[PDB]
Design a protein around this ligand. Structure first.
Ligand SMILES: *[C@@H]1O[C@H](CO)[C@@H](O[C@@H]2O[C@H](CO)[C@@H](O[C@@H]3O[C@H](CO)[C@@H](O)[C@H](O[C@H]4O[C@H](CO)[C@@H](O)[C@H](O)[C@@H]4O)[C@@H]3O)[C@H](O)[C@H]2NC(C)=O)[C@H](O)[C@H]1NC(C)=O
Ligand SMILES: *[C@@H]1O[C@H](CO)[C@@H](O[C@@H]2O[C@H](CO)[C@@H](O[C@@H]3O[C@H](CO)[C@@H](O)[C@H](O[C@H]4O[C@H](CO)[C@@H](O)[C@H](O)[C@@H]4O)[C@@H]3O)[C@H](O)[C@H]2NC(C)=O)[C@H](O)[C@H]1NC(C)=O
Ligand SMILES: *[C@@H]1O[C@H](CO)[C@@H](O[C@@H]2O[C@H](CO)[C@@H](O)[C@H](O)[C@H]2NC(C)=O)[C@H](O)[C@H]1NC(C)=O
Ligand SMILES: *[C@@H]1O[C@H](CO)[C@@H](O[C@@H]2O[C@H](CO)[C@@H](O)[C@H](O)[C@H]2NC(C)=O)[C@H](O)[C@H]1NC(C)=O
Ligand SMILES: *[C@@H]1O[C@H](CO)[C@@H](O[C@@H]2O[C@H](CO)[C@@H](O)[C@H](O)[C@H]2NC(C)=O)[C@H](O)[C@H]1NC(C)=O
Ligand code: NAG
Lengths: 51, 154, 51
């Protein structure tokens, strides 16, 4: 993680962070060079469907 | 789909147009707009016909055109999107329009969307543009109860 | 549980093929293990006979 700014998303998908998931409250107003999505990511808010 | 139509027309290589006499009944053709100014008077697109109501009546249309020639024909038509329901009643005498343009191999059905849009040249309305391709031996059927911008040829 | 498909029929005259001016549109869906398929219809439904 030294040369590139890396944002780790656990329990939080990028779309969930963008929308404002209750578990995604720590990603507000954050910048990155690589967003790492984990296999344990889940949603805990209203069900949604991006077309 | 703007890029698709642009690519089709660019790869075709011609703007040759042949006028066809469609049988529209009980309507008012040759609509005009204040934004489209030709010379000094109001006008519209030359290759596209605007069909409004006549005497507060817009009869349903069912128009056919067969392809008796030996090449493909491209028809460019459109759908009007009035800003408000009052505009829709004042232009087409109905509340909602339905347009169905079909061949023996394809069908496109479209419903207009009424709503306010930002004013370009003092008009809060829009027109969506669609196209259809008719191959030899095929037949083009246009069935619209309203909100139809008709083709003037192929 | 992961996808939805909502369809409204379109009524209009099409050129006759074998003396029929009506058409049928075909759709498909995929159900993964642990998922459930829900069909909710009020009309114009061509149902599946199996999988
Ligand atoms: C929904 O909201 C939209 C957005 O706010 C709204 O659209 C606005 O409608 C007004 C209706 O008057 C538009 O104002 C006109 O716009 C142009 C450009 O300025 C001119 O044609 C008009 O000027 C005439 O009228 C003035 C007022 O009397 C006179 O001073 C002048 O001399 C002219 O006679 C007039 O300013 C306005 O531009 C739009 N704004 C947009 C599209 O961004 C809409 O009406 C709202 N309601 C509905 C039901 O859609
Ligand atoms: C909208 O307009 C379209 C045409 O653009 C129209 O579709 C046409 O409908 C007619 C009438 O149903 C169809 O004609 C039939 O076609 C076949 C082949 O000929 C035959 O099944 C039928 O023959 C019967 O009728 C004859 C005349 O009485 C009898 O002699 C014979 O024994 C049969 O009883 C008949 O000719 C025609 O094929 C279509 N054309 C198309 C689809 O291109 C449509 O009905 C209109 N929609 C409306 C009014 O809602
Ligand atoms: C993601 O959620 C899991 C599952 O809740 C968290 O792991 C533990 O969850 C249990 C409840 O199942 C809590 O009691 C623990 O306190 C959680 N562990 C902690 C907070 O260390 C997990 O922490 C969440 N976050 C990540 C990054 O995996
Ligand atoms: C398709 O064209 C047909 C033929 O004109 C239209 O059917 C007419 O619909 C009006 C409005 O409901 C009725 O008053 C007429 O009696 C109908 N004519 C008949 C049954 O011969 C039809 O509306 C058109 N539009 C669509 C979208 O199907
Ligand atoms: C989804 O299925 C339900 C099954 O009940 C339908 O609900 C019924 O809808 C009819 C028609 O409006 C009503 O008369 C019944 O009272 C409803 N039953 C209830 C509320 O228990 C519903 O219409 C279906 N929706 C769609 C889009 O197909
Ligand atoms: C519309 O204009 C054309 C010529 O562009 C004319 O042939 C046709 O009769 C007109 N339709 C009317 C006046 O309804």
């Amino acid at each position: 993680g030294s040369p590139h700014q890396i944002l780790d998303g656990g329990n939080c998908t990028l779309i969930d962070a963008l929308l404002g998931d209750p578990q995604c409250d720590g990603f507000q107003n954050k910048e990155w060079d690589l967003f790492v999505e984990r296999s344990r990511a889940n949603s805990n808010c209203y069900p949604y469907d991006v077309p | 789909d703007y890029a698709s139509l642009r690519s089709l027309v660019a790869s075709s290589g011609t703007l040759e147009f042949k006028n066809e006499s469609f049988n529209w009944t009980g309507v008012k053709q040759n609509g005009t707009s204040s934004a489209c100014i030709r010379g000094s008077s109001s006008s519209f697109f030359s290759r596209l016909n605007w069909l409004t109501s006549l005497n507060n009546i817009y009869p349903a249309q069912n128009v056919t055109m067969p392809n008796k020639e030996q090449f493909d024909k491209l028809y460019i038509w459109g759908v009007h999107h009035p800003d408000t329901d009052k505009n829709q009643i004042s232009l087409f005498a109905q509340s909602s329009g339905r347009i169905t343009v079909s061949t023996k191999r394809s069908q496109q059905a479209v419903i207009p969307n009424i709503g306010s849009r930002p004013r370009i040249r003092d008009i809060p309305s829009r027109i969506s543009i669609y196209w259809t391709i008719v191959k030899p031996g095929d037949i083009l059927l246009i069935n619209s109860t309203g909100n139809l911008i008709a083709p003037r040829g192929y």
